[PDB]
Design a protein around this ligand. Sequence first.
Ligand SMILES: O=c1[nH]c2cc(O)ccc2n1-c1nc2ccccc2[nH]1
Length: 257
Amino acid sequence: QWALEDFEIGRPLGKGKFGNVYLAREKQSKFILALKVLFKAQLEKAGVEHQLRREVEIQSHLRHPNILRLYGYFHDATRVYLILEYAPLGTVYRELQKLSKFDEQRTATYITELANALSYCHSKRVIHRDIKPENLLLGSAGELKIADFGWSVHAPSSRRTLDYLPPEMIEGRMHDEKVDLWSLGVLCYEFLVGKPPFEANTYQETYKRISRVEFTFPDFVTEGARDLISRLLKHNPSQRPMLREVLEHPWITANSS
Ligand SMILES: O=c1[nH]c2cc(O)ccc2n1-c1nc2ccccc2[nH]1
């Protein structure tokens, strides 16, 4: 029940791969939100119509204050518009750019907020699979909001950025909700250090490094954090913790809230 006519388009917020995300306000209501404009010429030529259908079917059903809301979708001849929660303070990516590292209180908080989002996701049997700072957003009160469910699915799978991908995904093997735990470790490490634990200059070095769980900690990383990151980045996914173990990790609990 929506058309472009119902919106005034403000500034472009982010320049994505298949289109951009614009600030915008609904007209009858004066409601501020984000409008993500994908258009089909590129989507079909990339053959990802069903990836987008899952992104929608999933992100609509989910409601959680640490997950970006998708109020709905619509389309015309050329474009498909996603009507999205507007998150004022931008991405964690941009925040990490400004501040080469986060401290342990900011980092641990973001993780508790992220864990909640995930334990809710994994409760609905949904996996995100593309957690990274680019796909985390920040509400008006600084709160963390996961977005961009482009690579989400239900239950197990195979298929198959790459810094945040686990061995089971890149190597080709099948995988589950455990990927989001590996990614959470990558992400925790990056927050504290300022770069992902397996970063390389070429794809092929990164594959090998990820495959062999080849990462070292700086001197300045505390053992509490070292512990949680080491537990999350285990090659054998089964070994990686439950989300609640992470939420009730002493280092986390010390530094969260
Ligand atoms: O509010 C936002 N919703 C978004 C959805 C997306 O898929 C990607 C970016 C979104 N976004 C947003 N808010 C911003 C605020 C400042 C700078 C960039 C932003 N992107």
